[PDB]
RNA sequence: AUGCCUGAAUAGGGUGAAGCCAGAGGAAACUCUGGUGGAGGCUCGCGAAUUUGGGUAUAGUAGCAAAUAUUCAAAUGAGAA
């Protein structure tokens, strides 16, 4: 009964952590990409 | 040997390059997983070679000429494999 609560809380917390990590990664990657793209036109 | 003009052809099987998308690691750079995409001195059936049309320059013996399988009935005809 409570095993399901523990499992889904842990799963949602792990998903949240992975989401934070991937958002940080993509934000850095796209900021670098847009900077390079903006600078490549000259 | 090197050309030039105008046409035909430059096929097929396999593999899967940049680039892209989405995931996971690390502060970046960067490295892996899946997909996508469809490229090449990639493969498969000093020297040689490098498709093609037209035009245009520098003893009655040997033997039967070889490309397999012919058969039956009728017609024509002097005479029919």
UniProtKB/Swiss-Prot annotation:
Signal peptide: none annotated. It is found in: Nucleus, Nucleolus. Residues 13-42 form a coiled coil. Belongs to the class I-like SAM-binding methyltransferase superfamily. RNA methyltransferase RlmE family. SPB1 subfamily. Required for proper assembly of pre-ribosomal particles during the biogenesis of the 60S ribosomal subunit. Specifically methylates the guanosine in position 2922 of the 25S rRNA at the stage of 27S pre-rRNA maturation. Also methylates the uridine in position 2921 in the absence of methylation of this residue guided by snoRNA snR52 at the stage of 35S pre-rRNA maturation. Component of the nucleolar and nucleoplasmic pre-60S ribosomal particle. Interacts with the snoRNA-associated proteins NOP1 and NOP58. This is 27S pre-rRNA (guanosine(2922)-2'-O)-methyltransferase. It comes from Saccharomyces cerevisiae (strain ATCC 204508 / S288c). The chain holds residues 348 to 389 of 841 of the full protein.
């Amino acid at each position: 009964e409570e095993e399901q609560i523990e499992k889904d809380l842990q799963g949602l917390q792990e998903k949240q952590r992975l989401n934070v990590k991937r958002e940080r990664r993509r934000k850095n990657e796209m900021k670098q990409k847009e900077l390079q793209r903006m600078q490549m036109n000259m």
